[PDB]
């Protein structure tokens, strides 16, 4: 179920994964919810995406001291926008090494975001480069092309039948793709089919803006997307 810890949401969705949740206010659509991972590889724990700030992303680091207790080993996060790298400051006061998408990187600065210290580039066919994801354990990083954003990138759990979309996926029911000031229009619907098609197995499509959905909400995603175009 859904843990409180502070301000923060945490809910476990396998014995070694747990979502993390962090609000912020949006004009027009009230408190907002973003949802990143935290995975326990063996003695160590991976984080998928910090929270909007840095406090919020100090709590996840002291949920995880609490409830985990082994070092976080590298953060990876999805893309350059405050949900997903708001809390980068926070990462590194606490020495753990960060990982994004090298565009993400290049973006950073641009958005008002601090940039990861390590960056990602992808093989033509999307998987991530494995010489530039060292010790990333059982996270399979993805990009699956252009979509809520140039720099957007996935990530499976091997083990699990979790596989995360981030941003670029939005649950079977949802009524728009969301923020699309950044999206790339023309490519964002083979984009979202692509990830599905990356971790053809995985039966919890996890989001940054909705709960755990089937993959009904990536055939719905790729639908909406279709419009764009
Ligand atoms: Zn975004
Ligand atoms: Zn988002």
């Given at each position: ?15 070694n994964?747990?979502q ?6 949006m004009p ?28 919020q ?8 001291k ?7 080993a590298?953060?990876?996060v999805?893309?350059?926008?405050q949900d997903?790298?708001?809390?980068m400051?926070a990462?590194h ?13 290049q ?5 008002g ?15 991530v ?6 010790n990333?354990?059982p996270?399979?990083?993805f ?29 079977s029911?949802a ?7 950044d ?23 996890v ?9 009904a ?6 639908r ?6």
């Amino acid at each position: 179920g859904d843990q409180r810890f502070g301000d923060l949401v945490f809910r476990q969705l396998a014995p070694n994964v747990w979502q993390h949740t962090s609000y912020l206010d949006m004009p027009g659509f009230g408190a907002v919810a973003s949802n990143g991972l935290i995975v326990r590889d063996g003695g160590r724990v991976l984080v998928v995406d910090t929270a909007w700030t840095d406090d919020q992303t100090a709590q996840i680091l002291n949920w995880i001291k609490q409830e985990i207790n082994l070092p976080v080993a590298l953060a990876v996060v999805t893309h350059a926008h405050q949900d997903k790298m708001g809390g980068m400051d926070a990462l590194h006061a606490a020495g753990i090494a960060t990982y994004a998408n090298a565009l993400s990187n290049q973006l950073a600065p641009q958005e008002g975001l601090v940039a990861a210290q390590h960056s990602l580039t992808f093989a033509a066919n999307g998987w991530v480069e494995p010489a530039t994801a060292p010790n990333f354990g059982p996270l399979k990083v993805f990009y699956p092309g252009p979509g809520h954003t140039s720099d957007n990138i996935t990530v499976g759990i091997d083990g699990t039948d979790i596989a995360f979309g981030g941003c670029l996926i939005k649950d079977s029911k949802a009524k728009s793709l969301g923020n699309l000031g950044d999206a790339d229009t023309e490519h964002y619907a083979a984009s979202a089919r692509a990830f599905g098609a990356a971790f053809p197995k995985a039966s919890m499509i996890v989001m940054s803006h909705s709960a755990p959905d089937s993959r009904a909400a990536i055939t719905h995603t790729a639908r909406m997307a279709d419009k764009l175009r």
